[PDB]
Enzyme design. Structure first.
Site, mmCIF file in Angstrom:
data_model
loop_
_atom_site.group_PDB
_atom_site.id
_atom_site.type_symbol
_atom_site.label_atom_id
_atom_site.label_comp_id
_atom_site.label_asym_id
_atom_site.label_seq_id
_atom_site.Cartn_x
_atom_site.Cartn_y
_atom_site.Cartn_z
ATOM 1 N N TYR B 15 -5.814 -12.437 -2.151
ATOM 2 C CA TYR B 15 -6.025 -10.999 -2.002
ATOM 3 C C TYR B 15 -4.711 -10.222 -1.901
ATOM 4 O O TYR B 15 -4.531 -9.199 -2.560
ATOM 5 C CB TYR B 15 -6.852 -10.733 -0.750
ATOM 6 C CG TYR B 15 -7.288 -9.301 -0.598
ATOM 7 C CD1 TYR B 15 -8.441 -8.835 -1.233
ATOM 8 C CD2 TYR B 15 -6.556 -8.406 0.186
ATOM 9 C CE1 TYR B 15 -8.856 -7.515 -1.087
ATOM 10 C CE2 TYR B 15 -6.965 -7.084 0.335
ATOM 11 C CZ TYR B 15 -8.115 -6.650 -0.303
ATOM 12 O OH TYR B 15 -8.539 -5.359 -0.152
ATOM 13 N N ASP B 39 -10.733 0.878 6.708
ATOM 14 C CA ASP B 39 -9.282 0.892 6.642
ATOM 15 C C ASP B 39 -8.818 2.347 6.749
ATOM 16 O O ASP B 39 -8.951 3.115 5.795
ATOM 17 C CB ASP B 39 -8.832 0.299 5.302
ATOM 18 C CG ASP B 39 -7.330 0.192 5.183
ATOM 19 O OD1 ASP B 39 -6.624 0.801 6.009
ATOM 20 O OD2 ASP B 39 -6.854 -0.494 4.257
#
Lengths: 125, 127
Positions: B15, B39
């Site tokens: 990732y 986030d």
């Protein structure tokens, strides 16, 4: 509800308490009805009595060293996460364990929930 | 096919690789259709690949973002992992670094189901 800087402070102190092994001061950082999932994935421990029993067993006569291995990450809603390492010997051979802890604090600055991420792949001996 | 702890470490390490190279498309591919993203953690979550894709377009899209792992990936036995990393970019007209910690949960097919990122201004550093 702790600010981001206060979270960084509360969490740093926590590793300090684990490193020195003051079980009673550790338990007092938790809310009376806090939850602990360590390791994350297993059934949670509930309440100070159970949490105290858990620490008396784990940090009991063990003689463990613990240290932050990076800065404490903190949000604005009383939550934070930090990376740290737990080291022992008890076997003649130095053993290390890398963990990441996630905590959510309550309106009184006490730990409401704690989750520790780690598994056998994080052991190094 | 719920990933093992070792598979999680791989997936999560991959990732960050994509975020570094800038492969925005390979990143959205890793998320399940009804995945959720937070986030930074504490903010309302975005639901669905659409929103998620739109999200990364804004962030990583514009700006030569840089990112690297700062420690090993911690992984549980139930498809979850957590990892610490640093992001480098230009903030308010200055070179900055951002220390972050990501928490992810994968589904029965190795796709990211939930993602939560912990960071604040207290994690921002100059140069």
């Amino acid at each position: 509800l702790p600010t981001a800087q206060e979270v960084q402070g509360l969490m740093a102190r926590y590793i300090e308490l684990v490193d020195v092994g003051d079980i009673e001061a550790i338990v007092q950082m938790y809310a009376d009805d806090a939850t602990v999932e360590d390791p994350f994935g297993q059934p949670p421990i509930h309440g100070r009595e159970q949490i105290a029993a858990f620490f008396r067993q784990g940090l009991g006569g063990g003689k463990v060293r613990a240290c932050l291995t990076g800065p404490v990450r903190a949000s604005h809603n009383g939550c934070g996460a930090m990376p740290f390492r737990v080291e022992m010997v008890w076997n003649g051979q130095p053993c290390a364990l890398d963990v990441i802890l996630v905590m959510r604090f309550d309106e009184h600055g006490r730990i409401q929930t704690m989750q520790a991420y780690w598994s056998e792949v994080n052991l190094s001996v």
